[PDB]
Amino acid sequence: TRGSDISKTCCFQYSHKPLPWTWVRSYEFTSNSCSQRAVIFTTKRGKKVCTHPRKKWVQKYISLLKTPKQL
């Protein structure tokens, strides 16, 4: 099974700034086993940053960065 299932990483530093989609790659929500809860955006170099789902701009990058259609 060459899929993905190791996104264990909470969040504790939200960045306020629209990342350049040219250097953006994807995103991911925090796991339920985390002391806190937040969203995460990732760049094309591997720099994954944390963010909050409340900020409208964030919900805009989450949907833009492919929809979380995980059934």
UniProtKB/Swiss-Prot annotation:
Major localisation: secreted
UniProt keyword list: Chemotaxis, Cytokine, Disulfide bond, Inflammatory response, Secreted, Signal
Location within or outside the cell: Secreted
Cysteine disulfide partners in this protein: C10-C34, C11-C50
GO biological process, one term: monocyte chemotaxis
Tissue-specificity statement: Ubiquitously expressed at low levels in various tissues including heart and ovary.
GO molecular function annotations of the record: CCR chemokine receptor binding; CCR3 chemokine receptor binding; chemokine activity; CX3C chemokine receptor binding; receptor ligand activity
GO cellular component entries: extracellular space
Coiled-coil region list: none
Entry function: Chemoattractant for eosinophils and basophils. Acts as a ligand for C-C chemokine receptor CCR3 which triggers Ca(2+) mobilization in eosinophils. Also acts as a ligand for CX3C chemokine receptor CX3CR1, inducing cell chemotaxis.
Subunit structure: Monomer.
Family statement: Belongs to the intercrine beta (chemokine CC) family.
Protein name: C-C motif chemokine 26
Organism: Homo sapiens
Primary gene name: CCL26
Included stretch of the parent chain: 24 to 94 of 94
